Amino acid sequence: TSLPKYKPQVNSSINDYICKNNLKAPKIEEDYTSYFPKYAYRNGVGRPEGIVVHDTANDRSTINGEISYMKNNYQNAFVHAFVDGDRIIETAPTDYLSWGVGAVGNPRFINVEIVHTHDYASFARSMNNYADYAATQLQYYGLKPDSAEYDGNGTVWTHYAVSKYLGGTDHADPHGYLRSHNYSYDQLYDLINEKYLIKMGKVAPW
Ligand code: NA
Ligand SMILES: [Zn+2]
Secondary structure, three states, X not given: OOOOXXXXXXXXXXXXXXXXXXXXXXXXXXXXXXXXXXXXXXXXXXXXXXXXXXXXXXXXXXXXXXXXXXXXXXXXXXXXXXXXXXXXXXXXXXXXXXXXXXXXXXXXXEEEEEOOOOOHHHHHHHHHHHHHHHHHHHHHHOOOOOEOOOOOOOOEEXXXXXXXXXXXXXXXXXXXXXHHOOOOHHXXXXXXXXXXXXXXXXXXXX
């Protein structure tokens, strides 16, 4: 008796495209900085409670440019990783917090930024890449996917949901950005869930 194929819970032609074409996320590359702070989550080092979906709100920057700026501006903001259509770059260890979502969410969640992309295929790859990175973290930390968007409880959050339910911040990403590419947070969450289940050996790989 073989593993079942995951049945999508959120209709998504983009996720259908990603799956049908067996898109492979790239390696997770480190690019750490010696002077970034190494602060515990509220429950300890190595104790994130979930992960946040952000987007850069910048329609012109590249992943390299975002990282260069952040290395100089980390006292204002920094995040754990960036993804684009080509790369997944982890800029801070997930065992310590990052300064990406305000004083309430930072002690709880891994912060990951989606760099803006400018064609259909690269956007799709960037969603696959976010989802693969997120599912990797959830599996590594033993955190089952649970979306917080509509109840303020779970392991996968948007910046918007942190603003809405937790406070400490007032940003609304990533909903408007994903909508502009004919996608949605719930489509992304469904992809994260599928990849988590693949990594857990519960559903069939692509
Ligand atoms: Na929930
Ligand atoms: Zn954000």
